[PDB]
Structure 1
Amino acid sequence: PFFDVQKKLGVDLDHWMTIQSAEQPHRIPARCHAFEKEWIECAHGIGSIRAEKECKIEFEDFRECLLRQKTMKRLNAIKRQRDKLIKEGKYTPPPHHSGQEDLRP
């Protein structure tokens, strides 16, 4: 019993909130507005089964925009290898990562 009254009557009660890419006060965009737009437009009117089969790439890319698992995973790999290289003694950091390089602007 999803007695959908809102589309029958033509009023909206919670439709403006339900997604991240809706209308915002003076058009403040979210962090992953474009990815939500792509995933929403990929999976409109095709049903949930075809949504999980035919929009897996867009949905998983949007989910990586949301939580950022793989980004911090790669950063962890880089950080760990740099620390091991520093401790072992095969690497020296460049001067622009040390604190001064006459910054650009």
Structure 2
Amino acid sequence: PFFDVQKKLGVDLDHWMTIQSAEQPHRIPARCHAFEKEWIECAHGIGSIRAEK
């Protein structure tokens, strides 16, 4: 069971480590930044099957 203490207590203890394109300490990008931004916004609020296809 994927609990939601992460969202209920609100303190993002782990969401910075998770993807690329987060707040890097010196603001430098990764290799595929814009491709990730487009793919994440493409598959953001989508039902993970039509997001797949």
Specify if TM > 0.5.
yes
Distance apart, 1:17 and its partner CA: 1.1
Percent of aligned pairs sharing the same letter? 100
CA offset digits 1:66-93 (Å, max 9, x no partner): xxxxxxxxxxxxxxxxxxxxxxxxxxxx
How many aligned residue pairs are there? 53
> Rg: which structure is higher?
1
Distance apart, 1:47 and its partner CA: 1.8
Distance apart, 1:44 and its partner CA: 0.7
Specify every segment of 5 or more residues in structure 2 that has no aligned partner in the other structure, as ranges: none
Distance apart, 1:43 and its partner CA: 0.6
SS of match in other structure, 1:7: helix
- How far apart in 2 are the matches of 1:33 and 1:23? 12
CA offset digits 1:35-72 (Å, max 9, x no partner): 1111000011112102111xxxxxxxxxxxxxxxxxxx
- How far apart in 2 are the matches of 1:19 and 1:50? 22
Bigger fraction of residues in helix:
1
2:37 maps to 1:45: no
Distance apart, 1:4 and its partner CA: 1.4
Extract structure 1 runs of 4+ deviating beyond 3 A. Answer: none
Cα RMSD between the aligned structures?
0.8
| TM-score, with structure 1 as normaliser | 0.48
| TM-score, with structure 2 as normaliser | 0.90
Distance apart, 1:10 and its partner CA: 0.7
Aligned to 1:7: 7
- How far apart in 2 are the matches of 1:24 and 1:36? 15
